[PDB]
């Protein structure tokens, strides 16, 4: 579904780079500052259940110092983090 | 009969069942009410139309009157509106002035001579002001969704939410029956800083 298809129906793309969740830009092969973070899911009893959720952050966002702010917004959207009191 | 004088001379012949009922009420009030007794003698209506709002119990009575009496009606609109409701239980009354619209010309030279108060933009705005008269508009926005539709929202002051809240469903439907345009309402506490109020 993602990529370039010729009229013959085959996919003719070498690979599909990651698309950032915060900036919506493509993460290139020579970024070296882009990272992935895994946050564990904890069961009702209070221990981890063996599953995690993964986030990706483009390199330039970490250069401007806005990477921390982007993480806060994403976690709230996923319900990982609460707000107010 | 004297009460037929409250109608336009054309309709004095064979009035409809709604027309004379309003005429009797207007004639009776012109001699009884303290504040209406010096405005009513010069007043007469054009026609009365009945509208049934779907998914509702109350019905809406629309009264048309000539544009001459715009200032006359605005002076006593509050008392006149409430007085008519009592005589007609289970109904809502709105007073609307009858205005005409000149269609938008195609030629540039003709467009310069159009009387601006007869454009559809100006007329539809005044019709809305008639239906909510004791209240006024404090803001207006247009919402353009991705599907291509455009929805218009009108903000009223929150100070008079209690009075006019029950009537907004009727006003929205009647406004569509007269202009074929969609409207939606909201309330603003402190309209100066554009603060909307949720409940």
């Amino acid at each position: 579904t993602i990529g370039m298809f010729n009229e013959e129906g085959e996919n003719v793309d070498l690979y599909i780079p990651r698309k950032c969740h915060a900036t919506t830009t493509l993460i290139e092969a020579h970024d070296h500052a882009a990272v992935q973070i895994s946050i564990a899911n904890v069961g009702p009893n209070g221990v981890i259940n063996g599953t995690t959720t993964t986030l990706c952050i483009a390199g330039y966002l970490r250069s401007q110092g806005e990477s921390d702010h982007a993480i806060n917004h994403i976690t709230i959207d996923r319900g990982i983090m609460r707000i107010k009191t | 009969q004297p009460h037929l004088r409250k109608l336009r001379k054309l309709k004095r012949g064979k009035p409809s069942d709604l027309e004379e009922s309003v005429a009797k009420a207007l004639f009776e009030l012109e001699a009884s009410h303290k504040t209406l007794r010096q405005e009513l003698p010069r007043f007469h209506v054009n026609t009365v139309r009945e509208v049934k709002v779907p998914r509702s119990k109350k019905t809406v009575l629309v009264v048309f009157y000539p544009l001459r009496f715009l200032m006359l009606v605005r002076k006593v609109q509050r008392a006149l509106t409430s007085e008519l409701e009592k005589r007609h239980p289970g109904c809502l009354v709105m007073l609307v002035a009858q205005r005409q619209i000149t269609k938008r010309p195609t030629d540039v030279y003709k467009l310069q001579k159009v009387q601006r108060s007869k454009t559809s933009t100006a007329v539809f705005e005044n019709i809305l002001n008639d239906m909510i008269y004791p209240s006024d508009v404090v803001g207006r926005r247009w919402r353009c969704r991705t599907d291509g539709s455009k929805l218009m929202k009108v903000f009223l002051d929150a100070r008079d939410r209690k009075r006019i809240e029950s009537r907004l469903r009727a006003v929205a439907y009647v406004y569509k029956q007269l202009t074929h345009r969609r409207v939606s309402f909201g309330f603003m506490w402190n309209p100066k800083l554009q603060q909307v109020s949720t409940r």
Partner: protein, 143 residues
């Protein structure tokens, strides 16, 4: 004052409200408002000054929102408009006082420079008023 003829970039001005309906507590009929406007004109006030008297001491924020017409329109209907427009009148008065000062102080070169700017402003303004027929043709400014 700000942009034309100078480097000023000020922004000070008034901001009219979105709601154009007079308040409930204002109980003056439109006929009486028109009477007060015409009365102040015969006393000798200009349209700018008339609107400030009503604003300051009568509670009338905008004459148009009460009567439907602007102040200068009211004076024109009653035959009380000034012979020449108000802003052109004040610019001509300023240039006359500058010239009287300069005929004694002939070395005040800063004032001479300011006189050039004011007279250029007068000629631009006169050209506009002649095009819209608020001034007679062949009206001329005399130094």
């Amino acid at each position: 004052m700000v942009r034309m003829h100078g480097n000023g970039r000020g922004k000070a001005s008034s901001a009219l409200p979105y709601r154009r309906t007079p308040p409930a507590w204002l109980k003056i009929a439109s006929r009486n408002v028109v009477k007060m406007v015409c009365k102040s004109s015969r006393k000798g006030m200009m349209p700018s000054q008339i609107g400030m008297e009503l604003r300051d001491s009568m509670g009338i924020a905008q004459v148009k929102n009460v009567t439907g017409r602007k102040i200068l329109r009211i004076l024109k209907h009653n035959g009380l408009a000034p012979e020449i427009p108000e802003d052109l009148y004040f610019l001509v008065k300023r240039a006359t006082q500058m010239r009287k000062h300069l005929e004694r102080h002939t070395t005040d070169r800063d004032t001479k420079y300011r006189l050039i700017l004011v007279e250029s402003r007068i000629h631009r303004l006169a050209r506009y008023y002649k095009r819209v027929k608020q001034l007679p043709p062949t009206w001329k400014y005399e130094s």
